[PDB]
A paper describes a structure:
Protein Tyrosine Phosphatase 1B (PTP1B) is the prototypical protein tyrosine phosphatase and plays an essential role in the regulation of several kinase-driven signalling pathways. Here we identify PTP1B as an inhibitor of IL-6 and show that, in vitro, it can dephosphorylate all four members of the JAK family.
To clarify which pTyr was the preferred substrate, we therefore performed co-crystallisation experiments using the C215A/D181A/Q262A triple mutant which is catalytically dead. Two copies of the PTP1B:JAK2 peptide complex were present in the asymmetric unit. In contrast to IRK, we found that the first phosphotyrosine (phosphotyrosine 1007 of JAK2 and phosphotyrosine 1045 of TYK2) in both of these structures was located in a shallow, basic surface near Arg 47. The guanidinium group of Arg 47 forms a salt bridge with the phosphate while the backbones of both amino-acids form hydrogen bonds with one another. The location of the second pTyr in the active site means that the second aryl binding site is unoccupied.
Numbering used by the authors:
A (entry chain A): 2 to 302
B (entry chain D): 1005 to 1010
Write the structure that this text describes.
């Protein structure tokens, strides 16, 4: 049934039209805090701001602003924090938020450098023996181990609140081949990654919301969260034909502007959910099929 | 240059 709508949209060639429909219908809420002059150097992009009503507040008295938004999906029963790629001066804020919000996973969908341009600060440590200290926020971050696959890397990090000496294990899911304003290689590559995030428990209600970012935190991350929410909805109602993807995206856009940055990203989200539905509808084998088609394993020596 | 969508 959702397939019918997709095929119909494909055959008619109106993805750009449906996408501009969404853009016109999208919530427009104020972003006053984000626009204050004292926050200018806390925003990566002038055209990407969190709404005042859903922004994450840092628990600090000096300045509580971080370019991050809480996407709370009541019906799906999941929350996500969508944020920009941290700036050199906001890496401390970023890990502060992770701590305060009790997040267990960070999903990164960009590379620090793309097309010879810096898109995100190196906010995590690359070598076990070179930990990072964020003094402004009294936090220490250490690389424990990493698992490098062909198009993504999972990293196990330890976050330490120096004040209380309490420590937490953060999982870092880094999608390394997803270009800005582009789409993943295949549905299998995207879904294999998504279900790796799910299998880690990072999305369990027993934790804070997962943090999802890219460079701006709306395009690739919007694609990621949209697909995950629709698949949750499909599992709860059990009826795939009930889930209206466009309605879900508009809901999400009440909490952060610009989610899904291209019509092709919108088209891909449909593809991903339709394919992912195979798992919802009870095909145990399909998860191994995604792993093969993703070619995640690297070549030995 | 300081805009996400150009
Ligand atoms: Cl100000
Ligand atoms: Cl590049
Ligand atoms: Cl938009
Ligand atoms: Na530590
Ligand atoms: Na503590």
């Amino acid at each position: 049934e959702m397939e019918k709508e997709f095929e119909q949209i494909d055959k008619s060639g109106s993805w750009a039209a449906i996408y501009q429909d969404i853009r016109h219908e999208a919530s427009d809420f104020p972003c006053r805090v984000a626009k204050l002059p004292k926050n200018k150097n806390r925003n990566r992009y002038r055209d990407v701001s969190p709404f005042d009503h859903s922004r994450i507040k840092l628990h600090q008295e000096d300045n509580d602003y971080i370019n991050a938004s809480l996407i709370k999906m009541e019906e799906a029963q999941r929350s996500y924090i969508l944020t920009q790629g941290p700036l050199p001066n906001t890496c401390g804020h970023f890990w502060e938020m992770v701590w305060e919000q009790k997040s267990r996973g960070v999903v990164m969908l960009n590379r620090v450098m793309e097309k010879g341009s810096l898109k995100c600060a190196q906010y995590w440590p690359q070598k076990e023996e070179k930990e990072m200290i964020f003094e402004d926020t009294n936090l220490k971050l250490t690389l424990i181990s990493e698992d490098i696959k062909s198009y993504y890397t999972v990293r196990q990090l330890e976050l330490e609140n120096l004040t209380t000496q309490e420590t937490r294990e953060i999982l870092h899911f880094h999608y390394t081949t997803w270009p800005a304003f582009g789409v993943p290689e295949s549905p299998a590559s995207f879904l294999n990654f998504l279900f790796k995030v799910r299998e880690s428990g990072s999305l369990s209600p027993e934790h804070g919301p997962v943090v999802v970012h890219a460079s701006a935190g709306i395009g690739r991350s919007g694609t990621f969260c949209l697909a995950d929410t629709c698949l949750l909805l499909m599992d709860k109602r059990k009826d795939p034909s009930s889930v209206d993807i466009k309605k879900v995206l508009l809901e999400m856009r009440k909490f952060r502007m610009g989610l899904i940055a291209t019509a092709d990203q919108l088209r891909f989200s449909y593809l991903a959910v339709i394919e992912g539905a195979k798992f919802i509808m009870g095909d145990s084998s399909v998860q191994d099929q995604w792993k093969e088609l993703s070619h995640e394993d690297l070549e030995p020596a | 240059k300081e805009y996400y969508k150009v």
